[PDB]
Design a protein around this nucleic acid. Structure first.
Ligand SMILES: [Mg+2]
Ligand SMILES: [Mg+2]
Ligand SMILES: [Mg+2]
Ligand SMILES: [Mg+2]
Ligand SMILES: [Mg+2]
Ligand SMILES: [Mg+2]
Ligand SMILES: [Mg+2]
Ligand SMILES: [Mg+2]
Ligand SMILES: [Mg+2]
Ligand SMILES: [Mg+2]
Ligand SMILES: [Mg+2]
Ligand SMILES: [Mg+2]
Ligand SMILES: [Mg+2]
Ligand SMILES: [Mg+2]
Ligand SMILES: [Mg+2]
Ligand SMILES: [Mg+2]
Ligand SMILES: [Mg+2]
Ligand SMILES: [Mg+2]
Ligand SMILES: [Mg+2]
Ligand SMILES: [Mg+2]
Ligand SMILES: [Mg+2]
Ligand SMILES: [Mg+2]
Ligand SMILES: [Mg+2]
Ligand SMILES: [Mg+2]
Ligand SMILES: [Mg+2]
Ligand SMILES: [Mg+2]
Ligand SMILES: [Mg+2]
Ligand SMILES: [Mg+2]
Ligand SMILES: [Mg+2]
Ligand SMILES: [Mg+2]
Ligand SMILES: [Mg+2]
Ligand SMILES: [Mg+2]
Ligand SMILES: [Mg+2]
Ligand SMILES: [Mg+2]
Ligand SMILES: [Mg+2]
Ligand SMILES: [Mg+2]
Ligand SMILES: [Mg+2]
Ligand SMILES: [Mg+2]
Ligand SMILES: [Mg+2]
Ligand SMILES: [Mg+2]
Ligand SMILES: [Mg+2]
Ligand SMILES: [Mg+2]
Ligand SMILES: [Mg+2]
Ligand SMILES: [Mg+2]
Ligand SMILES: [Mg+2]
Ligand SMILES: [Mg+2]
Ligand SMILES: [Mg+2]
Ligand SMILES: [Mg+2]
Ligand SMILES: [Mg+2]
Ligand SMILES: [Mg+2]
Ligand SMILES: [Mg+2]
Ligand SMILES: [Mg+2]
Ligand SMILES: [Mg+2]
Ligand SMILES: [Mg+2]
Ligand SMILES: [Mg+2]
Ligand SMILES: [Mg+2]
Ligand SMILES: [Mg+2]
Ligand SMILES: [Mg+2]
Ligand SMILES: [Mg+2]
Ligand SMILES: [Mg+2]
Ligand SMILES: [Mg+2]
Ligand SMILES: [Mg+2]
Ligand SMILES: [Mg+2]
Ligand SMILES: [Mg+2]
Ligand SMILES: [Mg+2]
Ligand SMILES: [Mg+2]
Ligand SMILES: [Mg+2]
Ligand SMILES: [Mg+2]
Ligand SMILES: [Mg+2]
Ligand SMILES: [Mg+2]
Ligand SMILES: [Mg+2]
Ligand SMILES: [Mg+2]
Ligand SMILES: [Mg+2]
Ligand SMILES: [Mg+2]
Ligand SMILES: [Mg+2]
Ligand SMILES: [Mg+2]
Lengths: 88, 114, 100, 68, 275
RNA sequence: UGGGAGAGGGUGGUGGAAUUCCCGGAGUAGCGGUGAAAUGCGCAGAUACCGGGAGGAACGCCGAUGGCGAAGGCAGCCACCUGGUCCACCCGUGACGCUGAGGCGCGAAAGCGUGGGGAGCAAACCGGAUUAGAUACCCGGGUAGUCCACGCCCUAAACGAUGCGCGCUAGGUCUCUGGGUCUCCUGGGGGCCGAAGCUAACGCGUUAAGCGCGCCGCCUGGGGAGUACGGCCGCAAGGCU
């Protein structure tokens, strides 16, 4: 799966500031990691629909968030997603 | 001719079989309900196993049999009484064991077991 | 990686040379599939509750190791290959659970 | 005559502890419940799986003949 | 997989082709090809002995290694996968380390560039050759010699594979693609895995000429002939078969066993084909 | 951050018991089946026994008033991939939230297409019996189908006949899994009886059917009828409205 380490590197590389956690930008990047690894996961096990549910709720979250960020800090809405290539 | 051997009791709702085997397991003689002259549910009776088990033993010892280990399979109302006369027959009945078969949820049974 | 308990059961009849030779295969195959040993516990022949390979006995090994999680399966598939290898059970090593 | 008392410390996961594990299988090789083993929920469950694994390695039986 | 077309002509609405995707090199190995002498069914007398052939596309025969014990212990690399219009399977382009090249048919699962080898001490892995006394019982195999050194004879078409059932004396037991159980010999090589192109049978020619490109002409019905021609022939208007359905040579064609009775191969055959 | 339990879902390996058939040894006058019988199988050697082999399917005890899942549903063992969820610490973002016509995805069984597979069982079917009759209930056979892969099909007593989220309103006993200080206290689920209250009654009652707020779906006598017409979906049977 994802490694605590791999999780940290992201965390740090998106934290608003040193001891940053649980912030929009990071809160999206984690999901983005889980998502991108479910999709890359599901591209084989095409039958495991069960898992495919949370994958939606995941993106549901991230889509819920992003729009919040969209609502509040625009410039920050782009830059981010652009750093993750997320808009389809 | 053999002195020690075996005895299997196939006990079923509809009948009861008594077959006696050599130590290796090769049958030497056998008997069940109808052999004593019964036809039908009357076969599914203990007293049948008696004559059945008895008539099988009687014929068995005639070949020299004197000892046999016992083996019972099934859930028949003629089962135990069969185990009886065998002991009260003329054989040493060296042991009793229930090797009744039972799956572990394998093949489906007929409609009348559900 | 991950640490498991390689549980292997081998033909009880083989001679010593017939014996460890399979192990060498195991040892190598182990090594080849990125296996790093730790403990070990070769318990010799032993009584079984029921005949494997229609053979009542069975000579067991036992390896705690730590290999790449993404390479365990191809192993046992490599170990079960031996006509003398007869049981092969890998188990994710786990903290003991005690009673009383 | 519950069994858990009959023993002290012992690994529910020592799936090779035949002499111990084989203690919970009635003389017909079956697994024994909880009104008979004194084990609890989480406990009980952690057993069988332990037993089973061995019952696959060739240690414990899947079943046994019965003697009277 | 298999490729379908759209109903953009009446014959495509159904036709299907292979996808080849397992194809790597589109040109045979000159030194391994040679002329295939077409026949039209006819023989060394000009008389047709195999009704309804002729006119198929021209082909160039790929010499094949049905021995592979020809080079024991000389590993090689699967250089390329090619297509042989002379059989349903796919051929593998083997570059041995000697330098010599030669063709085999592609077991299912090969990959360009992977290595293979033949010999008793050879690894059991999709693409290697061994005798039969040395292959694991239960492994699916193919390219099986029917007898020692007489060349591969069994499991040579698409998806074809024979599985090893048990061993007896100097022989071993295989399950042929025809469900039959036969004693083969242990010293007869095989090749682990199954043959490739298993998607073959799912193919729909779609139109009539596509059976001509394959050199197989039209096949007429005895019902459409006349009594001078076929047993079923003649009769005003249409008509049933008026007799045990027979071949144009007289004999029956609905369940008449013709495998020679006193044939020795019997002693080594166990279970006649199934279904 | 740190943990925990679990038939949650998916792929690949795999373990033993039993049924069916094949082969071998031994053995004799019946086996099987029923409320009783008969068809049927058996001197061409069956039934019951021993031994070996092949194949498919479902996983005995554990197991349970249990567990997980949004639902249908999920149960031998192993590993890998992955989801949801709970508890603690009270670390970060600082209302970012609930609902959700449309849309989309999932969806037990049967059924459909293609290619496998096929032991047991088993619609139609044949046979034997019960009957006034027995196109049935019981018995002997037996084809699809039940199994795998990829596609559809999208319905049901798909039930808690109870939409989802939040807040407020005595408790008692049992059980699952957590945390503590371990007598006991606290979180989250699963049942039971019951405070007040509701309810046409039977009943529910911190898992409300109680007092409330928000949002969706829905009802408007019975039958005709979930039928006709049109439209959409579908290979078809048929589905939705
Ligand atoms: Mg989530
Ligand atoms: Mg967005
Ligand atoms: Mg009877
Ligand atoms: Mg092996
Ligand atoms: Mg341990
Ligand atoms: Mg096209
Ligand atoms: Mg197309
Ligand atoms: Mg056209
Ligand atoms: Mg057309
Ligand atoms: Mg087409
Ligand atoms: Mg193509
Ligand atoms: Mg190709
Ligand atoms: Mg392809
Ligand atoms: Mg050319
Ligand atoms: Mg030339
Ligand atoms: Mg030629
Ligand atoms: Mg020629
Ligand atoms: Mg000539
Ligand atoms: Mg001439
Ligand atoms: Mg001439
Ligand atoms: Mg000619
Ligand atoms: Mg001809
Ligand atoms: Mg011709
Ligand atoms: Mg041609
Ligand atoms: Mg082709
Ligand atoms: Mg075709
Ligand atoms: Mg033709
Ligand atoms: Mg014709
Ligand atoms: Mg004519
Ligand atoms: Mg003429
Ligand atoms: Mg004629
Ligand atoms: Mg005619
Ligand atoms: Mg006419
Ligand atoms: Mg006529
Ligand atoms: Mg006629
Ligand atoms: Mg021959
Ligand atoms: Mg059949
Ligand atoms: Mg026989
Ligand atoms: Mg047998
Ligand atoms: Mg139960
Ligand atoms: Mg329940
Ligand atoms: Mg704070
Ligand atoms: Mg602040
Ligand atoms: Mg919602
Ligand atoms: Mg469905
Ligand atoms: Mg289904
Ligand atoms: Mg069809
Ligand atoms: Mg059709
Ligand atoms: Mg079919
Ligand atoms: Mg059938
Ligand atoms: Mg029936
Ligand atoms: Mg009538
Ligand atoms: Mg009648
Ligand atoms: Mg009838
Ligand atoms: Mg039947
Ligand atoms: Mg069909
Ligand atoms: Mg039909
Ligand atoms: Mg079906
Ligand atoms: Mg089907
Ligand atoms: Mg719907
Ligand atoms: Mg219910
Ligand atoms: Mg509920
Ligand atoms: Mg309803
Ligand atoms: Mg309401
Ligand atoms: Mg606790
Ligand atoms: Mg509670
Ligand atoms: Mg109550
Ligand atoms: Mg009251
Ligand atoms: Mg009210
Ligand atoms: Mg609740
Ligand atoms: Mg709603
Ligand atoms: Mg009206
Ligand atoms: Mg109305
Ligand atoms: Mg309807
Ligand atoms: Mg209409
Ligand atoms: Mg309708």
């Amino acid at each position: 799966p994802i490694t605590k380490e791999e999780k940290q590197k992201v965390i740090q590389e998106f934290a608003r500031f040193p001891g940053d956690t649980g912030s929009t930008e990071v809160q999206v990047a984690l999901l983005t990691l889980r998502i991108n690894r479910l999709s890359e996961h599901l591209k084989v096990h095409k039958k495991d629909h069960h898992s495919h549910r949370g994958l939606l709720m995941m993106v549901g979250q991230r889509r819920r968030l992003l729009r919040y960020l969209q609502r509040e800090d625009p410039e920050r809405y782009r830059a981010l997603i652009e750093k993750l290539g997320i808009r389809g | 001719q053999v002195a020690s051997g075996r005895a299997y009791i196939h006990a079923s709702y509809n009948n009861t079989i008594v077959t006696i085997t050599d130590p290796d397991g090769n049958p030497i003689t056998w008997s069940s309900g109808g052999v004593i002259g019964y036809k039908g549910s009357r076969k599914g009776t203990p007293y049948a196993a008696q004559l059945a088990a008895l008539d099988a033993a009687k014929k068995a010892m005639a070949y020299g049999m004197q000892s046999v280990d016992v083996i019972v399979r099934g859930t028949g109302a003629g089962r135990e009484q069969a185990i009886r006369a065998l002991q009260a027959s003329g054989l040493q009945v060296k042991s009793i064991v229930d090797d009744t078969p039972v799956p572990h949820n394998g093949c489906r049974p007929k409609k009348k077991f559900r | 990686m991950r640490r498991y308990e390689v549980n292997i059961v081998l033909n009880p009849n083989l001679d010593q040379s017939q014996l460890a030779l399979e192990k060498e295969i195991i040892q190598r195959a182990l090594e080849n599939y990125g296996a790093r040993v730790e403990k070990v516990e070769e318990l010799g022949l032993r009584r079984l509750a029921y005949p494997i390979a229609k053979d009542p006995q069975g000579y067991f090994l036992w390896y705690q190791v730590e290999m790449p999680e993404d390479r365990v399966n191809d192993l046992a598939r490599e170990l079960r290959i031996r006509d003398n290898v007869r049981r092969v059970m890998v188990v994710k090593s786990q903290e003991p659970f005690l009673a009383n | 005559a519950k069994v858990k008392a009959t023993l002290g410390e012992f690994d529910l996961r020592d799936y090779r502890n035949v002499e111990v594990l084989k203690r919970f299988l009635s003389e017909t090789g079956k697994i024994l419940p909880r009104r008979r083993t004194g084990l609890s929920a989480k406990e009980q469950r952690i057993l069988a799986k332990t037993i089973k694994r061995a019952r696959i390695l060739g240690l414990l039986p899947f079943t046994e003949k019965l003697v009277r | 997989a298999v490729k379908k077309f759209k109903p953009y002509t009446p014959s495509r609405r159904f036709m299907t082709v292979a996808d080849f995707s397992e194809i790597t090199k589109t040109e045979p190995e000159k030194s391994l090809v040679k002329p295939l002498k077409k026949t039209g069914g006819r023989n060394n007398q000009g008389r047709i002995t195999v009704r309804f052939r002729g006119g198929g596309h021209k082909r160039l025969y790929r010499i094949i290694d049905f021995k592979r014990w020809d080079k024991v212990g000389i590993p090689a690399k699967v250089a390329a996968i090619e297509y042989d219009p002379n059989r349903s399977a796919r051929i593998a382009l083997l570059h041995y380390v000697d330098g010599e090249k030669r063709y085999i048919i592609a077991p299912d699962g090969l990959q360009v560039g992977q290595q293979v080898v033949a010999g008793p001490d050879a690894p059991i892995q999709v693409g290697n050759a061994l005798p039969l006394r040395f292959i694991p019982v239960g492994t699916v195999v193919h390219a099986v010699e029917l007898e020692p050194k007489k060349g591969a004879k069994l499991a040579r078409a698409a998806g074809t594979s024979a599985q090893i059932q048990g061993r007896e004396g100097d022989y071993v037991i295989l399950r042929l693609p025809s469900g039959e159980l036969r004693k083969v010999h242990g010293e007869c090589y095989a090749t682990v895995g199954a043959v490739g192109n298993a998607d073959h049978k799912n193919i729909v020619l779609g139109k009539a000429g596509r059976s001509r490109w394959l050199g197989r002409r039209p096949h007429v019905r005895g019902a459409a002939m006349n009594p001078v021609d076929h047993p079923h022939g003649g009769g005003e208007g249409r008509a049933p078969r008026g007799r045990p359905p027979a071949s144009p040579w007289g004999w029956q064609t609905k369940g008449l066993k013709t495998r020679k009775r006193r044939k020795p191969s019997s002693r080594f055959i166990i279970a006649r084909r199934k279904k």
